[PDB]
Amino acid sequence: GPAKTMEEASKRSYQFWDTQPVPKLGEVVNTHGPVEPDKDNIRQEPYTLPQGFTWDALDLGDRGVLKELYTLLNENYVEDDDNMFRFDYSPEFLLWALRPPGWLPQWHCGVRVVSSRKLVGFISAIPANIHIYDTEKKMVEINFLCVHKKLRSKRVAPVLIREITRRVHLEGIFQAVYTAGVVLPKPVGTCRYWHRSLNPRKLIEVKFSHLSRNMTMQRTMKLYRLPETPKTAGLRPMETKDIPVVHQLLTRYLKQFHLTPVMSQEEVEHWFYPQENIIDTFVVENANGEVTDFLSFYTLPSTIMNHPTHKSLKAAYSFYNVHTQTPLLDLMSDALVLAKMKGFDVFNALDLMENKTFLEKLKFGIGDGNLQYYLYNWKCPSMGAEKVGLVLQ
């Protein structure tokens, strides 16, 4: 099944995605708007699962249920291209990603074995207001689509997708945004992960990265060495009093991109207020007391699959970085120093927004995984990575 490049995606047919309100691969789009109308009748009954499986909405406020979801994902969610590392989203992270303002329990859509109640599938929706070119639309973000390794290739993923679609339709929402490492009809933008080594000794030892064979280990560590403390004047962790100005800075900064979130002040608090081992946000408060810039990154460690009891690969993911007075190059240099100080092994960033202006300069290396962005039921021109201004978890 899965195609990872648009060349190989052109050489195949999509039994499920051809039935969905998305553009065809290779269709060049010059219009802007829905593929199909809002529905004034929505199917009241859940879609049929294969015999022996049943739907269950996951109440994550139940500690036992949250652990079941953590375990499903820890054992069956996204792996790297070589099946050496698997995302290890923490339970507290999952609460952050899955209970933002406006979350709904019916949108934490699980699949369980009927007889044993074992959790074997999941998909989620959370609400988001999305600015796409000249339109703002209430949408959902879809995330954490996961089918147990023992249930794979049994066409359960289309049922999960149709069911969350139905459950979102019931709430009057008819567009969605989502990302995937695979190519489907039809990316609105294609982004690439880059990686900045922070602890190269460990990255090479777990074979996340490789010694250039013309470089010694000693020389690699000198290459990637960073200052012990950040250089930007007035940098400090975001505090409650910074919520309004962070909201103001973000809103004005995102206007320059073509696919962005539109966050309320309560949403800004949720996504940026620091939570240890989940989300870090630092603001620049200058000599006048004014907050002029901020950087942020989230915590997403990964199981080392070939050595399971060893300490996970600790990765920080660039989130939103807003500059109005500090040069973005300096802000991101301080992001690296802070991630290093907090024990991260690698700092990851996509090539979206203005990130290409600093990636090579700050010694990021290009990754092997593309991140495709998609809209459901919204046909619009595609855009280059540097116009994508949306980062998901």
Binding site: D80, N143, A180, Y193, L371
Partner: peptide, 10 residues
């Protein structure tokens, strides 16, 4: 969902 990437090898 998100995707897992690692440094491209020459």
């Amino acid at each position: 969902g998100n995707c897992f990437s690692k440094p491209r090898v020459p």
